[PDB]
Amino acid sequence: WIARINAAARMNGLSYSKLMHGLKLAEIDINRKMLADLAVNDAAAFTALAEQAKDALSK
Amino acid sequence: MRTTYMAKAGEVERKWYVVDATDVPLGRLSAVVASVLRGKNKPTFTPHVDTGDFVIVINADKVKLTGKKATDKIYYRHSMYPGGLKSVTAGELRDKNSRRLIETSVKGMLPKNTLGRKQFTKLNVYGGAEHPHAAQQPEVLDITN
Amino acid sequence: MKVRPSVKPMCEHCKVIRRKGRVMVICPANPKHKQRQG
Amino acid sequence: TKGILGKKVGMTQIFTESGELIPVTVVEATPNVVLQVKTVETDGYEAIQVGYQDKREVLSNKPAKGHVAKANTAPKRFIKEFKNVELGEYEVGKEIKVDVFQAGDVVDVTGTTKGKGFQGAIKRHGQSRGPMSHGSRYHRRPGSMGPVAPNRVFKNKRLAGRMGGDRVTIQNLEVVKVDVERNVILIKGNIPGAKKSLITIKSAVKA
Amino acid sequence: SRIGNKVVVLPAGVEIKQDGNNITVKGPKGELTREFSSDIKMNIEGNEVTFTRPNDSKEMKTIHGTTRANFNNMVVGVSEGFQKALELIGVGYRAQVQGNKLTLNVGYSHPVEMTAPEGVTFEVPANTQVIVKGINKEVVGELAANIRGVRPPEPYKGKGIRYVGEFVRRKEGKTG
RNA sequence: GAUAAACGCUGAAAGCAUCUAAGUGUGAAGCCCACCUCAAGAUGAGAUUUCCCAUUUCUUUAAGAAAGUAAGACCCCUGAG
RNA sequence: GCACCUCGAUGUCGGCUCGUCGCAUCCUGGGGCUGUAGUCGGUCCCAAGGGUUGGGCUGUUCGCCCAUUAAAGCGGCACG
RNA sequence: AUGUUAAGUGGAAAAGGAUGUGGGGUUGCACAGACAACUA
Ligand SMILES: [Zn+2]
Numbered sequence: 001w002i003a004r005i006n007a008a009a010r011m012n013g014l015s016y017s018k019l020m021h022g023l024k025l026a027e028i029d030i031n032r033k034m035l036a037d038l039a040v041n042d043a044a045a046f047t048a049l050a051e052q053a054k055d056a057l058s059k
Numbered sequence: 060m061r062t063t064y065m066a067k068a069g070e071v072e073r074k075w076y077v078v079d080a081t082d083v084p085l086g087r088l089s090a091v092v093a094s095v096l097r098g099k100n101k102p103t104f105t106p107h108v109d110t111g112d113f114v115i116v117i118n119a120d121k122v123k124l125t126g127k128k129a130t131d132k133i134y135y136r137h138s139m140y141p142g143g144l145k146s147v148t149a150g151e152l153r154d155k156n157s158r159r160l161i162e163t164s165v166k167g168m169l170p171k172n173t174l175g176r177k178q179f180t181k182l183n184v185y186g187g188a189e190h191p192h193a194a195q196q197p198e199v200l201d202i203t204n
Numbered sequence: 205m206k207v208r209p210s211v212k213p214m215c216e217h218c219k220v221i222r223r224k225g226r227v228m229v230i231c232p233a234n235p236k237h238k239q240r241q242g
Numbered sequence: 243t244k245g246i247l248g249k250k251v252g253m254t255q256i257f258t259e260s261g262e263l264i265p266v267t268v269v270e271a272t273p274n275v276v277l278q279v280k281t282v283e284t285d286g287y288e289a290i291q292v293g294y295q296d297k298r299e300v301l302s303n304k305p306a307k308g309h310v311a312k313a314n315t316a317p318k319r320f321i322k323e324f325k326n327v328e329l330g331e332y333e334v335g336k337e338i339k340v341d342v343f344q345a346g347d348v349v350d351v352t353g354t355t356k357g358k359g360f361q362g363a364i365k366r367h368g369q370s371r372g373p374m375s376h377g378s379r380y381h382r383r384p385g386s387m388g389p390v391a392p393n394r395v396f397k398n399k400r401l402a403g404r405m406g407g408d409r410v411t412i413q414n415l416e417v418v419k420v421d422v423e424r425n426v427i428l429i430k431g432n433i434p435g436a437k438k439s440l441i442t443i444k445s446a447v448k449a
Numbered sequence: 450s451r452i453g454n455k456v457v458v459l460p461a462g463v464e465i466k467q468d469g470n471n472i473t474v475k476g477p478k479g480e481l482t483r484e485f486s487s488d489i490k491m492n493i494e495g496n497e498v499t500f501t502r503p504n505d506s507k508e509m510k511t512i513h514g515t516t517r518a519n520f521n522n523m524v525v526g527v528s529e530g531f532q533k534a535l536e537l538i539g540v541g542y543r544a545q546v547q548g549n550k551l552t553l554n555v556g557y558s559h560p561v562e563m564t565a566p567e568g569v570t571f572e573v574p575a576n577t578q579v580i581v582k583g584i585n586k587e588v589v590g591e592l593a594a595n596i597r598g599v600r601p602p603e604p605y606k607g608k609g610i611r612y613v614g615e616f617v618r619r620k621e622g623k624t625g
Numbered sequence: 626g627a628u629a630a631a632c633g634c635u636g637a638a639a640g641c642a643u644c645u646a647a648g649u650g651u652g653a654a655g656c657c658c659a660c661c662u663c664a665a666g667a668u669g670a671g672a673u674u675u676c677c678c679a680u681u682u683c684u685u686u687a688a689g690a691a692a693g694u695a696a697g698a699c700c701c702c703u704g705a706g
Numbered sequence: 707g708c709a710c711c712u713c714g715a716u717g718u719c720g721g722c723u724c725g726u727c728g729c730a731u732c733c734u735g736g737g738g739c740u741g742u743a744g745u746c747g748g749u750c751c752c753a754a755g756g757g758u759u760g761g762g763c764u765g766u767u768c769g770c771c772c773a774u775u776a777a778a779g780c781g782g783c784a785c786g
Numbered sequence: 787a788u789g790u791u792a793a794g795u796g797g798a799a800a801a802g803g804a805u806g807u808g809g810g811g812u813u814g815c816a817c818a819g820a821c822a823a824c825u826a
Contacts, residue, residue: 001063008102033063039102040064126794141396141726147657151627180669205631205738207751210803220804223644225793227804230643236739241803242751278674285673304696305676312674356706363724372723385724389786396726411661436706447660451640486647507807508646514637515647522635587635591650594634598651605743622743 008039022053075197293318353435453513539608543576
């Protein structure tokens with residue numbers, strides 16, 4: 001799961017560690033299992049989430 | 060035993076790429092090429108399946124070596140006959156037979172089993188600016204790493 | 205040539221140099237004084 | 243440069259002008275024919291394909307007749323390639339005869355050595371025997387196979403096996419005489435091979 | 450640099466073309482070119498030049514001194530040219546000149562033959578003197594050290610070929 | 626052909642001197658070729674010349690099965706270089 | 707020196723046959739210094755491609771001797 | 787973010803040797819002219 005998430009996030013301008021920090025600073029609690037499942041099936045949902053993380057650590 | 064995707068044999072498309080090797084140190088270019096051949100940049104990565112792309116390396120003659128590697132880094136070989144080490148080569152490979160150079164760097168950064176040996180047959184290396192593979196319509200990759 | 209791990213100027217006209225990573229003494233008055241550290 | 247194919251007839255003797263006795267080897271070479279010309283644009287290098295010794299026609303097949311048809315000859319028994327010869331100067335159909343060489347003409351000579359079969363280390367490699375008396379049980383054997391530490395035998399440990407039958411060339415021999423109406427060359431010394439076996443003669447590499 | 454700061458002022462005939470790196474002094478004999486570096490630059494107001502240095506380099510002065518020395522040499526030679534004179538002691542030795550063929554007779558069981566390239570010549574007046582003449586400072590020096598290399602001078606009688614000012618030390622070989 | 630010890634040429638840092646930092650050479654029975662032999666199972670399996678060119682039912686039409694053949698090869702017999 | 711290892715078994719030295727590797731180089735190749743005139747030498751540096759002998763006496767290595775040679779190297783490999 | 791190393795040091799070893807480079811100090815001699823180089 002972690003390697004698939006890294007692969008997907010680097011396509012949205014992030015890396016794995018910065019995106020995990022961003023999701024924690026926003027209070028999102030998705031598994032790494034559902035995150036990878038989204039990364040392969042629903043790219044638009046994965047981008048919604050990556051934008052929320054990018055705005056969280058923009059402070 | 061539940062739902063995580065696993066890819067199949069001929070299901071994930073493989074694209075062709077062109078990478079340019081003028082003034083990139085040997086190992087940095089070689090690390091990036093090695094990750095692209097294994098498919099690590101695609102969320103469909105599964106370890107018992109092959110999902111990497113093909114790579115063309117152009118301008119291997121102008122690859123960079125820092126320090127005194129061009130004279131002091133040596134490649135050895137044994138013929139398995141008594142007293143038969145061959146320490147013949149140095150950065151002479153970069154002058155003559157610069158495909159050997161790039162290939163032996165990329166080969167040591169791939170797994171050592173039957174999948175990693177089949178992923179090595181997607182590297183095509185050229186000492187000059189021109190390749191013979193224009194019918195596969197390859198796209199340019201740009202390195203900064 | 206003398207090759208010794210102690211290389212020392214031994215008259216007036218001896219000079220010390222570094223032609224690689226290698227200390228040497230060079231004298232124009234006496235060729236016995238020429239030395240290279242090793 | 244110069245080079246011809248022939249067959250081995252045998253050895254004899256001859257006296258010279260001054261009156262010295264000299265051992266010799268007769269080689270017979272009827273005219274050789276150029277069958278093909280290899281160039282860099284087509285093949286990647288430069289050479290010449292030559293044939294020797296006409297063959298009856300129940301003994302060849304259709305691909306061979308097609309290969310020999312562009313040169314207007316009978317099918318041949320022996321076909322070799324001759325390299326490092328300024329092409330020009332040559333074309334399919336030409337005949338190379340023994341007057342390519344003249345007396346003098348230091349030359350190289352190649353063949354295939356006689357066959358001898360399964361032979362031991364003493365005849366095959368020049369190894370020496372053990373003692374024949376004095377309580378000995380070690381006459382005609384190949385020696386110790388190595389030391390203990392590597393737990394194995396090294397390569398090029400030499401043993402018994404099949405002897406002879408390899409190709410061998412001998413350098414810097416002289417042409418003593420050339421006879422044109424008989425297609426014969428006389429070479430000073432001995433050559434490798436049996437009688438009726440293929441022999442190749444080229445001008446020498448060390449000049 | 451004291452050398453790096455000094456002045457090079459070009460006598461008559463000098464033209465100095467600029468193209469990126471290359472400089473090409475020309476004069477009444479030759480038209481030498483040499484490749485110089487970026488971090489030291491050209492100059493204006495003909496019949497004078499100085500070189501300059503952006504500081505803060507580690508050694509702070511070396512490249513400067515060499516980049517001026519070389520240009521001063523090119524000018525000094527393209528207007529004037531250089532000279533090297535070789536003597537001959539060692540009874541029985543002689544040189545002779547035939548175009549670019551320098552023939553030498555030094556104790557050997559064969560004469561020795563040297564041939565001078567484009568920019569260089571020879572000048573043998575007598576069986577003892579030789580003169581190497583050119584524009585380059587490097588090539589004239591290399592060729593003279595080549596010639597004197599055929600037979601250096603011994604110390605017990607000082608025979609052999611020497612530069613025309615070499616100070617040779619003389620030993621006392623005993624009489625047996 | 627490129628080098629070891631050694632020896633330079635031009636040259637500054639360090640107005641001089643200095644084989645070295647930038648540039649430029651010489652130099653060993655040693656190193657890579659040069660000579661001889663093996664080698665495309667080099668699964669990266671390479672190249673050139675010549676020779677040979679279509680019946681039957683269908684699972685379904687598919688790199689389908691089965692049958693008789695071309696060029697060529699082999700079994701079997703007389704042997705030896 | 708020690709006693710980890712092997713006591714339901716790990717057979718000692720010289721010679722023979724067959725070698726291979728290190729270099730702290732015995733010869734041959736290239737060099738600097740000499741209290742190096744030449745002919746021979748001393749010593750230090752680079753160099754492992756190839757070469758490195760037959761007898762007498764002792765079970766003998768070791769050793770001494772005889773006649774030669776460009777030279778008659780020193781170690782590891784279960785003191786092969 | 788700010789520096790150091792050019793030795794593949796990092797990624798085995800000492801007495802001793804050295805105009806390798808970074809930082810901090812103590813001073814002799816300097817425009818009533820220094821060190822070096824060239825005349826006499
Ligand atoms: Zn002195």
